[PDB]
Design a protein around this nucleic acid. Structure first.
Ligand SMILES: Nc1nc2c(ncn2[C@@H]2O[C@H](COP(=O)(O)OP(=O)(O)OP(=O)(O)O)[C@@H](O)[C@H]2O)c(=O)[nH]1
Ligand SMILES: [Mg+2]
Lengths: 70, 69, 82, 94, 80, 485, 82, 82, 75
RNA sequence: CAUCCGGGUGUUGUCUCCAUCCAUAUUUUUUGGAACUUUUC
């Protein structure tokens, strides 16, 4: 029953982490679209599971994304 | 727009040469306009099978060279 | 809305261009396609620590061009009008 | 076409392309991460579907380095167009 | 080397062309036909490659060249 | 005196497609195809091959200024004095030419134009035994009469793909004067009537098995083509395959929408009538009663067609033919609807089986080819042949067996003769060639004395394989001669 | 039902409404005629070269005519054939 | 539509050569081609990027991963271009 | 013929051990159960497990792996 | 076998009447899976 887009929608205003084409991320999701571009707050940059820096307010481009996770 | 004419290769075992210098084998069961492949499962090239049937994405295929003539 | 339009409007500009492979390209933009395919004249290719290679005409593809370094003097707001 | 454009704009206002728009409106200094290891600290001027950008007050950050070596380099550029596939993550430092 | 001051690629059809591709090879030959996606037909095509020294050379012939792999094109000479 | 045939090397017409490039196609066996053209009297066969030819060749010496704008149809493939004065076609005559399909790839085609009189069915049997597919040419007015039935039964009997042409559409409106609807009803009655006798298939304008054409006015089209010239602008590309299948078959069109609904709302005509027959009657009736001025505007503002100042003045008929040929271009709808309606796999094996012993093929260097008929061309005589396997060469000594002998099936088995000359049949001329490849029907000189009626032609490398090859059956002539002198 | 085309899509000549014009009945009458008439263009012919009475004796003699004129039809046909 | 595509289609039957992104040249009879250069080939040799060669029967290749295609020089002559 | 979409649907219906390969990334694989379906190859896959490939096992939660970087499926 | 009443086209001259090609980013092309480091030569 649960498709991806609705899951994504649900997960707005909640913690998420993103891997890339590689470095892990960690932040609260602000909003999403059809193309799967992201906008996050309280972004923390997990360099292979090592929080290098806390950027805060960020916007991730879709094509570099690998997966979403809580 | 046009369908990939792989009706010749239907129900035959094919070497799906796939992205990153890898390979797959298996008998061809189906496909679509994006060239995704649905195939009854076989090994990854010494050798080890995973799965009962397998689905390969379109983008990933380098080649699908026919094992059977 | 469209940056394509803006690009088109930029005509006859002597500009540097930067590629996905880092090649610095000094030339006069005679035209650009709707898909960012740059057409230069009086062109000068240099790498990012080695010698230079000059050419008269270069048609560079849109996918390659990372960053077009714009001219010195430019009214941007005006350009951005439809 | 116009209708489509309007819809797109609305989406941007609502969704994940809102923040960037806001930044543009405000014209604050912002940083961009890029595929080729280039931290682009610059003032945004233009914005579109592809996340291509016209940039003023441009200050890139990278490292020309053939191993083992450690150098940190950065250059000022007045005006600079940017392509969107390059962009990984844009960010706003208050 | 000398060449005219064209507007587009289409207007300079059948000119001898240097061509660069993402892999680093250099295809040289006369542009017979262009594309919506910048694919090129080349009349007498020669792939020229450089191993990591000096120019290695291969004559191909009539070649369809995909635009994905094309980086940029340059004019080698005039017609004929 | 006897025939009318051109003997010089320098007077053969100039074939705008570069003959040399055609002969290269012969190397690719899959590329070349054999189409025969058969149909009852005065269905327009020969004058159709005229359209094809004079489309292909650039300058023909046989055109008078008269027949070029012609009141009188130029009949290129006629070729015999007796067939000129008799007004009929008698001995079958083909041509070979390459033509671009609608996708722009060119393919080499051998037309065999058969006679249409039901006493000459003897020479339609040849056109079946040779050709890979058959165009059955039909008069819209005459409909399908019993002889047409026999043509489709003989076609489907010999395992030969079919395509129908509905010819002589000018005779429909310009004579019978049917209202736009009633014509369409008539087409539904014919096309409905021909499917009845084709058991394993159903033809239909959308499946591209049927080509609407009028030869005397020189236009051939298929709804796919006509859609591709004109309606392809208005609608986005991904719709086209959609739109065409929505053209035929009782669906209507109201505003921007296709609705199979009974005809409700206000205005009612079927789609095929709305987008085709109505603008066609507009083409005729305007091409006659309109003034050259407003018409001259319509043709730019719709069909993207321009008219020279010479063309503005002819007559009703010549100017009509000019306008139609000028709208509907050189006939690519025919070439296509022929091209994709033929599958070599399902058929070729079946026929080669039907014409011989049925067995797995002895493919190889060895040459196996079917000698059909001894045809007379202007110079001397010629033997007509189709190459099923092998490569002929000028000067080979080859075995030639009577088909009357193939019921029999070491030394003593050998008749043999040289191959002195190999031509390609071009109708009014004969084009010399060095060698022939597999699957093209060509002409040999010097076999004539080895047989009567059909004969088989083989040259084998090994003694062992000669036991393993198969021979052709005595060819079937539909009518059996009853009339005795 | 399932799909629609963009409105403004109309048969290519649908702009012009009437497919029958006041003259076209007569045009279709001419398009089948014996000769100087179908063409609608031509060149002058010397006055004595227009045979008005030929078409009458090429046709059958009809019926009610007494033998005297049937003989005349035969005579004239004989001269013509010669 | 693309003229290179057309050319490729025409080359059907002929022995085309064919390198990929990987740099693995093939040479064979072109069986079938599509708008997207989705080539099939018969009786095809296959060179590795390093050097070694391998014979193989009926290769399929997806145009995405194709780099450049060599067609025979007879097709230069006619009759696609004009 | 069995289309890919159909196969995906079937898998979803089942809820079976799916083992995904990554595009242009040999060393890593995913192992879970398909929950979602999209027009593209993208899906959501709850109870996923990242795997380092044999040239063990690693902790991982619920994930949607993006359609562009998929390679293999099996279910 | 000829005569006779006619005819077409071409060139030149002369005469008469007038004038100086889609519109748009999520697998086959252009929104890239690129880069960094190291050996041999
Ligand atoms: N109205 C109309 N008449 C046509 C058309 N095509 C041919 N005819 C007439 O029908 C007669 C037959 O045309 P042809 O093609 O020369 O005859 P045919 O097809 O060779 O008949 P067969 O000798 O038996 O093969 C001709 O005298 C034409 O005048 C046409 O398209 N429309
Ligand atoms: Mg005939």
């Amino acid at each position: 029953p649960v498709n991806p887009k609705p899951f994504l929608k649900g997960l707005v205003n909640h913690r998420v982490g993103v891997k890339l084409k590689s470095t892990e991320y960690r932040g609260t999701l602000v909003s999403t679209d059809n193309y799967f571009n992201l906008q996050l707050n309280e972004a923390e940059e997990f360099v292979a599971g090592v929080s290098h820096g806390t950027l805060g307010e960020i916007f991730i481009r879709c094509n570099n994304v690998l997966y979403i996770r809580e | 727009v046009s369908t990939p004419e792989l009706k010749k290769y239907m129900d035959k075992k094919i070497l799906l040469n796939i992205n990153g210098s890898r390979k797959v084998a298996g008998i061809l069961r189906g496909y679509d306009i994006f060239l995704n492949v649905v195939l009854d499962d076989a090994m990854e090239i010494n050798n080890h099978q995973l799965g009962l049937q397998t689905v390969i994405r379109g983008n990933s295929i380098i080649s699908l060279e026919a094992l059977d003539a | 809305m469209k940056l394509v339009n803006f690009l088109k409007k930029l005509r006859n500009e002597q500009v540097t261009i930067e590629l996905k492979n880092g090649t610095t390209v000094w030339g006069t933009l005679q035209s650009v396609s709707p898909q960012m395919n740059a057409i230069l004249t009086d062109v000068k290719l240099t790498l990012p620590s080695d010698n230079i290679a000059s050419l008269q005409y270069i048609n560079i593809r849109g996918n390659t061009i990372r960053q077009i370094i714009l001219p010195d003097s430019l009214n941007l707001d005006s350009l951005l009008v439809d | 076409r116009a209708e489509l454009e309007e819809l797109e704009e609305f989406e941007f206002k609502h969704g994940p392309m809102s923040l960037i728009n806001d930044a543009m409106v405000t014209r604050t200094p912002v940083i961009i991460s890029l595929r080729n290891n280039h931290k682009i600290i610059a003032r945004v001027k233009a914005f579109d579907r592809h996340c291509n950008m016209v940039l003023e007050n441009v200050k890139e950050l990278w490292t020309e380095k053939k191993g083992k070596n450690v150098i940190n380099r950065e250059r000022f550029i007045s005006k600079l167009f940017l392509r969107g596939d390059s962009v990984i993550v844009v960010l706003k430092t208050p | 080397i000398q060449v005219a001051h064209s507007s587009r690629l289409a207007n300079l059809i059948d000119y001898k062309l240097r061509v660069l591709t993402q892999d680093g090879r250099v295809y040289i030959g006369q542009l017979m036909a262009f594309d919506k996606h910048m694919n090129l037909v080349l009349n007498e095509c020669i792939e020229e490659r450089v191993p990591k020294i000096k120019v290695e050379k291969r004559v191909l012939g009539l070649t369809i060249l995909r635009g994905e792999q094309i980086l940029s094109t340059v004019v080698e000479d005039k017609p004929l | 005196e006897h025939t009318i045939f051109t003997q010089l090397k320098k007077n053969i017409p100039k074939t705008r497609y570069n003959r040399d490039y055609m002969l290269s196609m012969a190397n690719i066996p899959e590329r070349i195809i054999n189409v025969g053209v058969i149909g009852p009297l005065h269905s327009g066969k020969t004058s159709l091959m005229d359209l094809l030819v004079i489309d292909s060749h650039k300058r023909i010496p046989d055109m008078s200024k008269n027949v070029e704008l012609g009141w009188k149809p130029l009949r290129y493939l006629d070729n015999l004095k007796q067939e000129i004065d008799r007004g009929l076609s008698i001995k079958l005559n083909g041509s070979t030419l390459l033509c671009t399909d609608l996708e722009s790839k060119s393919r080499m085609i051998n037309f065999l134009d058969a006679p249409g009189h039901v006493n000459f069915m003897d020479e339609t049997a040849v056109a079946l035994a040779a050709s890979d597919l058959v165009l059955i040419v039909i008069d819209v007015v005459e409909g399908v009469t019993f002889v047409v039935e026999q043509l489709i039964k003989q076609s489907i009997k010999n395992n030969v793909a079919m395509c129908f042409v509905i010819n002589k559409l000018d005779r429909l409106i310009l004579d019978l004067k049917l209202p736009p609807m009633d014509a369409y009803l008539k087409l539904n009655h014919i096309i409905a009537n021909i499917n009845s006798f084709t058991k394993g298939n159903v033809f239909s304008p959308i499946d591209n098995n049927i080509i609407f054409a009028s030869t005397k006015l020189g236009f051939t089209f298929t709804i796919k083509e006509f859609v591709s010239y004109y309606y392809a602008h208005s609608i986005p590309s991904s719709k086209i395959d959609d739109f065409t299948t929505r053209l035929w078959g009782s669906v209507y069109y109201h505003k921007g929408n296709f609705r199979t609904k009974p005809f409700e709302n206000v205005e009612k005509y079927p789609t095929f009538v709305e987008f085709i027959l109505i603008p066609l009657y507009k083409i005729f009736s305007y091409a006659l009663s309109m003034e050259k001025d407003k018409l001259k505007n319509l043709l730019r503002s719709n069909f993207r067609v321009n008219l020279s100042q010479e063309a503005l003045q002819y007559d009703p008929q010549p100017f009509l033919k000019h306008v139609l040929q000028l709208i509907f271009r050189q006939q690519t709808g025919l070439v296509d609807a022929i091209t994709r309606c033929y599958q070599p796999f399902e058929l070729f094996d079946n026929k080669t089986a039907h014409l011989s012993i049925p067995g797995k093929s002895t493919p190889e260097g060895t040459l196996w080819a079917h000698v059909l008929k001894t045809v007379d061309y202007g110079g001397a005589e010629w033997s007509l042949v189709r190459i099923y396997s092998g490569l002929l060469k000028r000067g080979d000594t080859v075995r030639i067996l009577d088909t009357s002998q193939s019921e029999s099936r070491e030394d003593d088995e050998t008749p043999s003769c040289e191959v002195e000359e190999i031509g390609l049949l071009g109708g009014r001329y004969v084009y010399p060639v060095h060698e022939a490849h597999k699957g093209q029907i060509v002409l040999i000189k010097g076999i004539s004395s080895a047989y009567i009626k059909s004969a088989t032609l083989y040259s084998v490398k090994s003694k062992e394989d000669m036991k393993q090859l198969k021979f052709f059956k005595p060819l079937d002539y539909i009518t059996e001669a009853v009339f005795k002198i | 039902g399932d799909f629609t085309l963009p409105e403004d899509f109309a048969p290519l000549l649908a702009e012009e409404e009437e497919l029958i014009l006041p003259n076209t009945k007569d045009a279709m009458s001419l398009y089948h005629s014996p000769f100087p008439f179908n063409r609608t263009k031509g060149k002058m012919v010397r006055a004595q070269d227009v045979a008005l009475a030929k078409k009458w004796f090429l046709q059958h003699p009809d019926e009610e005519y007494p033998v005297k004129v049937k003989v005349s039809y035969q005579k004239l046909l004989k001269n013509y054939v010669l | 539509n693309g003229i290179p595509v057309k050319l490729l289609n025409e080359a059907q039957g002929h022995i085309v050569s064919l390198e990929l992104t990987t740099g693995a040249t093939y040479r064979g009879k072109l069986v079938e081609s599509e708008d997207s250069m989705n080539v099939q080939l018969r009786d095809v040799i296959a060179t590795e990027p390093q050097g070694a060669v391998t014979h193989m029967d009926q290769i399929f290749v997806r145009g995405s991963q194709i780099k450049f295609i060599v067609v025979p020089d007879l097709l230069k002559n006619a009759p696609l271009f004009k | 013929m069995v289309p890919p979409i159909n196969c995906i649907f079937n898998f979803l219906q089942q809820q079976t051990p799916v083992t995904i390969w990554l595009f242009e990334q040999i060393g890593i694989r995913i192992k879970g159960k398909i929950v979602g379906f999209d027009e593209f190859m993208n899906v959501v896959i709850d109870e996923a497990v990242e795997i380092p490939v044999n040239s063990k096992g690693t902790p991982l939660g619920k994930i949607l792996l993006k359609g562009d970087n998929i390679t293999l499926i099996t279910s």
